[PDB]
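A common beginner's mistake is to predict each chain separately and then try to dock the pieces by hand. The better habit, illustrated here, is to supply every component at once so that their relative placement is modeled jointly.
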Amino acid sequence: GLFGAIAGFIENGWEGLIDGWYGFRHQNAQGEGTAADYKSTQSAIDQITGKLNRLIEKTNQQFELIDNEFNEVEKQIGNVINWTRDSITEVWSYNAELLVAMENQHTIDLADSEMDKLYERVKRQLRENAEEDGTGCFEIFHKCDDDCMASIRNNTYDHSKYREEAMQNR
Amino acid sequence: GLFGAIAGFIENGWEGLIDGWYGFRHQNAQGEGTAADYKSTQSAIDQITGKLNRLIEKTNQQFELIDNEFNEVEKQIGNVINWTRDSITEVWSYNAELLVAMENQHTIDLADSEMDKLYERVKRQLRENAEEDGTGCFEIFHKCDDDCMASIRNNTYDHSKYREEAMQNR
Amino acid sequence: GLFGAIAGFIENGWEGLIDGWYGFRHQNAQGEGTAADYKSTQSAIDQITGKLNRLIEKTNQQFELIDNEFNEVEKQIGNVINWTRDSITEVWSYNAELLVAMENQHTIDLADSEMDKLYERVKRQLRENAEEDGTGCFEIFHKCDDDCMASIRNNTYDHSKYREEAMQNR
Amino acid sequence: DKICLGHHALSNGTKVNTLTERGVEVVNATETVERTNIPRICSKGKRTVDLGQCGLLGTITGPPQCDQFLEFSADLIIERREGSDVCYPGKFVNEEALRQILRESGGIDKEAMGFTYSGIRTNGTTSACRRSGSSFYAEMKWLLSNTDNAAFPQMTKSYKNTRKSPALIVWGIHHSVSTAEQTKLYGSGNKLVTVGSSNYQQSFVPSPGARPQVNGLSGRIDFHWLMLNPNDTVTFSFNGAFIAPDRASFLRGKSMGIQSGVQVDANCEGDCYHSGGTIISNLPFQNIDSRAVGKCPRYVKQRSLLLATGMKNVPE
Amino acid sequence: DKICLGHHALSNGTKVNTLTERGVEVVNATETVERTNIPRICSKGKRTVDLGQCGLLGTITGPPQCDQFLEFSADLIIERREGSDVCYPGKFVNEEALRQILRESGGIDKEAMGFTYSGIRTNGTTSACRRSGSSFYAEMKWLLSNTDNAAFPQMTKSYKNTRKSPALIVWGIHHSVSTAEQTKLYGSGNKLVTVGSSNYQQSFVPSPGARPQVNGLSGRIDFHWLMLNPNDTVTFSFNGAFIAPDRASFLRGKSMGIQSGVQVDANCEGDCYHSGGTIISNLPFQNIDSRAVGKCPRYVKQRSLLLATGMKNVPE
Amino acid sequence: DKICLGHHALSNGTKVNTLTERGVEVVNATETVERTNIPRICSKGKRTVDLGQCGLLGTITGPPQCDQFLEFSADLIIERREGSDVCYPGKFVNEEALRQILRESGGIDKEAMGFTYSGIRTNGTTSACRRSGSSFYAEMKWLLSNTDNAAFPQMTKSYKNTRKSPALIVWGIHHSVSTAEQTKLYGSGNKLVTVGSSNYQQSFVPSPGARPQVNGLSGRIDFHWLMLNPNDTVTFSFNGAFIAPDRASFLRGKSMGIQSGVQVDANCEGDCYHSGGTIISNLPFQNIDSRAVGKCPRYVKQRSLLLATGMKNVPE
Ligand SMILES: *[C@@H]1O[C@H](CO)[C@@H](O[C@@H]2O[C@H](CO)[C@@H](O)[C@H](O)[C@H]2NC(C)=O)[C@H](O)[C@H]1NC(C)=O
Ligand SMILES: *[C@@H]1O[C@H](CO)[C@@H](O[C@@H]2O[C@H](CO)[C@@H](O)[C@H](O)[C@H]2NC(C)=O)[C@H](O)[C@H]1NC(C)=O
Ligand SMILES: *[C@@H]1O[C@H](CO)[C@@H](O[C@@H]2O[C@H](CO)[C@@H](O)[C@H](O)[C@H]2NC(C)=O)[C@H](O)[C@H]1NC(C)=O
Ligand SMILES: *[C@@H]1O[C@H](CO)[C@@H](O)[C@H](O)[C@H]1NC(C)=O
Ligand SMILES: *[C@@H]1O[C@H](CO)[C@@H](O)[C@H](O)[C@H]1NC(C)=O
Ligand SMILES: *[C@@H]1O[C@H](CO)[C@@H](O)[C@H](O)[C@H]1NC(C)=O
Ligand SMILES: *[C@@H]1O[C@H](CO)[C@@H](O)[C@H](O)[C@H]1NC(C)=O
Ligand SMILES: *[C@@H]1O[C@H](CO)[C@@H](O)[C@H](O)[C@H]1NC(C)=O
Ligand SMILES: *[C@@H]1O[C@H](CO)[C@@H](O)[C@H](O)[C@H]1NC(C)=O
Ligand SMILES: *[C@@H]1O[C@H](CO)[C@@H](O)[C@H](O)[C@H]1NC(C)=O
Ligand SMILES: *[C@@H]1O[C@H](CO)[C@@H](O)[C@H](O)[C@H]1NC(C)=O
Ligand SMILES: *[C@@H]1O[C@H](CO)[C@@H](O)[C@H](O)[C@H]1NC(C)=O
Ligand SMILES: *[C@@H]1O[C@H](CO)[C@@H](O)[C@H](O)[C@H]1NC(C)=O
Ligand SMILES: *[C@@H]1O[C@H](CO)[C@@H](O)[C@H](O)[C@H]1NC(C)=O
Ligand SMILES: *[C@@H]1O[C@H](CO)[C@@H](O)[C@H](O)[C@H]1NC(C)=O
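With all components supplied together, the output reads:
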């Protein structure tokens, strides 16, 4: 997509992540773990469901028969009707095709951006205590125990309390 | 929106900012002040007005009466006409609804990006003399007097002249 | 566009770049040179061509004559036909105008983002060995010979092998 | 040492189309074009009249197959292939227009026209309208001359519409096998009938001659109609050949008319119908039948148009 | 110490709909569907003809109410409910087609057909066309037989169209109260009229009989028409029952025709009209009247569709 | 010291329109509206029948100009301005409907109706249908009375349709110059013709009188038609004035019909046609002719709509 995260600087998705759409995978002295981010996941789900709510409906507009399947209407009027119906079919087939392609383009990009927004959120939380890997990872100078990792996930991580030791490892 | 600035990492808008769409609010030894950015504001206004110029018009195509309100046309032809008109009404009602929703999605995102573009401009001006807060703020190491702040706003700020003192405060 | 690179923080395009859509222009002790990035260029070309493949076609739907150029049909039915045709013409003229404007908006932004994605790729490769200029340039602390520059272009550049000397020049 | 951001994925996605790409795989997707038909007329909660062997135009004239439909009331009217409008062979002028009126009528109420007759017979019948022996259209009167070859006098009959809604008036014209049968019935000579209301003017001279034996009979009855407005009057000048309306029809309200060959089902509800059944769906489009009626998804030519409901699938 | 970036906001935004969201609040928005009507026909700068009591088809035949409209010129033609096409009760065959022609005609110019008559009367009049005493349609001639019950001879009349634009030709057919009144007027026997031009063939035998007393009269006049091409000739064979055209009509140019019940106003300009008035607007859509005509915003079913003209509103 | 990222550009771009901007310059762009016409009928690979002087309806009746088109087969049928349906002046009732049927017929196959006649002539001819001396419509028979002023007896003729597709039946009605010429041809008195099939009822009394001399002749022949269904029978009662069908037409398959004034060309292939030629294009829209037919780009009112195929142009 446009934001270059999904099928971009992030190599690929995780098939083990069954908990949400987006998430964190850490690696420290205590080992590897993976957890789903609710906020980002929910923001994408809510936008996608809002699209569906908009699209999944027919109108209250009634149309009646203007021709006859058991007793053919006069040929001239019948041909005008068929021409008109076919013309209308052509408009709706176009509308339907264009609507779906446009929506799908936006849905994919929308998901791409939510991934990027999560990425930039964390970068900002970590401040000068970390550096970008380039593959969708943040190498952390100071020692993050499983507690530390959970503080980052839950938006409570205080950068100033590990700054000097991380800075000293420049 | 897609760029995650408005209703994103920036908590909220300023109701006191009556001067433009976007702006700077500083805080130093001389106190707090707020000023509107013309360039960003104008770029968004110009794009939005360009949308309106495109949309606010009817066509030069004339349509005439094909039925009669004082003297009903023959029933068969009348029903074909009504069916055709209702079919056309259904197309335009769809077109109108989809146009407005698509435009509004783009307008909101367009404003979001202009906010982000201003944010990234300033980040780039400040170089290594500042660090990102995360809420839409840049904490500045060296001492910016009201003159200093105006240099940033007006795109004249020279990072190299305050670098060492800001760097030394790492 | 939305991503603020083309006609944004990059002042202007290069007329000498006839090799691709995007590229690098370096400046070192060995002099200036310019080279095209294949990957970014190809990604934009492929998306644009995919649009064309979608759009460049008519349908297999046949329409026949319902009126007569040599022998005018009865006036009433003729006026209904003309009204219907004109109504349909009005829908397609709208569809065509809106399609092209929407596509063009997306094409321009799509190209803008590809430029930005290349910019961010390189920033990430260089790590702490460089700093952003603000005009679309990365000032490099350590000494990049023409070999060095080609390593950046070809995605092989190892930041850790020049880190200390670049860091020491902070 | 490190913390990494990522997103979910599957081994195998669902292909969808975008502005730039055919067949891009996404995590999840859903259909926008309805293809599921229900092979019944889903009429739960609706006053339904299934005409069966009764033709819809026969509800106005009343051949024996339509005896139970002379004053029906309905939200939904179903025409069947086996329907017939006639007992004595014949057809209506402006027939489809009249069917369209009756389909959305809400059904019909009948009222005596109030015609009396002096100097002629009024009880013409036939073998083809069977009600235990010969009969005729229940709402009509076959007017003859008192006796064989007798002069059918020139006649002037009125009906005023004293109600607040338009009255549907129907009358017929007979076409005997011979030119000699026209003389026996109504006397010899050219017969003329005319009709005049505020916005209507028309006249009909008969046309005898042999026709194919339909229902074993080679005669035909023309059927004719107009909508007589409230407080308007309609006049019938006639010398013969003429089938007189006994009752007038008034329309009840609103309905929807369909043609179909499948069974009624009061267990399901639907508002979109076609000859093969009912389209029940919340999807915006359908690819079942371009002539579906009621409140329907829009017909499109594509069988399927998948809408992405998840991010792009980028597996390991 | 710090510098912060932000954006403007209000305490209370304007709700709009997007692709993903119903009722998202934005800083500013504007309407795209026009709902404001002007209850006048805004005709500033246009040659306007308000027909009033004159029926549009009456401009071709000329009943007394249409005397001042026999050769009108117009950009805009207004039909009124009180309009009447006839003085002597009657109606036109193919009437709506003819109204459509006349609505966009630019008005009409009249020219003598050049008919002379020998062996018959030519000055038939009536009580229902009042010009201080009895009269008749100003552009027509009621042809009778010299005297009561006299033989109306078989007649052959031509008119060539020597001009470069098609000539509208109108003629009538009379329907007397009695079958005996047809004999008094034009002599007894079946009367035949026929018409033949390069691309036209039609014939009309009359049809006497009693009709409701319209204008106190129970007779009717049929009215008929065709477009005679440049250098084409048209022939009328007739034995009676026939109302002869005195003048032919030629169309002037271009116009727009409307039906309406509101006043003309030369103080406002508009190009979109409906019966209730004028839609003056630059907005792309309107929800006032689906049958509006001229150059109009597209009719949509929604009353309102707000277009965002500001960023999303994110207050404190 | 430094490495810089950039993008290509030109001194001068191509202007295009976007959602926000008119006339933004881009690196490259391409046209979406087709304006290039090919001034030929491109018929490579198609069975083509160019009717030339034969009128399309004349293929059913067979005037001399249509002698080589009585049983044509085609994928593409071309009508020309010089085409004429008639030799003896006349026209068809419901003509455009019949042209529409024949345009998509795939052409026609002819079959003997099987009529025999006793007590009348069958070989009426004229000066206007020239096949080295007088003649008549090749598929029709002009029925007269044995001799001048002789009684044309009342007649009853049948044709059953034993094939599996509907039979097109055509018959005529003659309109002599005089009322005296009608008596010479078929005997004096009012003549009646009637037609009856399962779903058809109509009758036609003639109408003599003088008409303009077309082809030097002032008589006219009416032409009439219906579609007789498989296993259906059609009856013709007649006392005269009647032009009898000799053969019936059956439709072959499928075709496309066009009207045009340009030459056929078997060197180019196309599927979108108009009177001025062929629109060959892959573009989604065209601004050549709103009445183009076949499989065409959609007609739009704009002459040009450029689609960006490159980034925005931002030169030095
Ligand atoms: C208008 O189109 C309808 C189909 O939408 C045509 O009716 C079909 O005709 C085909 C070929 O004869 C039959 O196989 C089908 O049974 C018909 N379907 C229906 C629903 O009627 C119809 O002939 C067309 N009208 C005209 C005047 O050509
Ligand atoms: C076609 O639709 C029009 C309305 O758009 C119908 O006319 C209306 O009929 C209703 C109900 O009788 C009246 O209340 C209105 O006064 C009518 N409005 C107008 C503008 O005429 C019309 O009946 C429909 N035509 C047919 C054949 O059903
Ligand atoms: C329907 O529109 C067509 C044009 O699309 C009209 O036909 C044209 O009429 C103009 C003015 O008389 C002529 O200059 C052209 O030669 C005609 N073009 C074609 C292709 O026929 C036609 O008159 C309209 N029909 C009605 C009933 O008004
Ligand atoms: C993916 O894998 C196989 C086809 O290779 C199939 O069994 C399965 O249904 C596929 N799933 C999806 C969602 O396409
Ligand atoms: C995928 O989409 C379908 C709609 O077809 C929906 O019902 C279902 O809940 C979705 N499945 C998952 C796992 O999200
Ligand atoms: C029909 O009506 C007449 C009344 O004049 C009567 O004489 C005759 O018997 C009736 N015929 C039948 C079969 O009812
Ligand atoms: C019809 O006439 C009656 C009086 O007999 C009156 O009450 C009613 O309002 C009239 N209706 C109309 C539509 O004029
Ligand atoms: C916002 O506040 C109140 C409603 O609570 C109302 O008076 C005012 O008009 C509102 N303004 C807008 C723009 O919605
Ligand atoms: C808001 O939009 C309206 C259009 O309805 C416009 O006229 C007005 O100038 C705008 N107001 C502000 C404060 O921008
Ligand atoms: C009508 O015309 C005839 C001319 O033959 C004349 O005798 C008669 O008086 C006229 N009648 C009137 C009322 O003008
Ligand atoms: C009509 O005939 C005249 C000669 O009298 C000629 O000048 C004119 O061009 C002809 N018009 C047409 C349309 O053929
Ligand atoms: C640009 O330059 C000139 C017009 O000033 C013209 O010769 C040339 O064709 C232009 N090229 C494009 C692509 O517009
Ligand atoms: C520009 O677009 C055209 C289509 O009109 C295409 O054929 C051509 O290859 C393109 N030119 C360049 C230099 O990309
Ligand atoms: C026409 O047919 C009749 C057969 O009765 C015959 O007598 C007559 O000579 C024929 N005339 C011509 C010109 O063939
Ligand atoms: C017509 O009748 C024949 C028997 O003669 C039969 O084979 C055929 O199926 C019938 N066709 C139809 C449509 O009923």
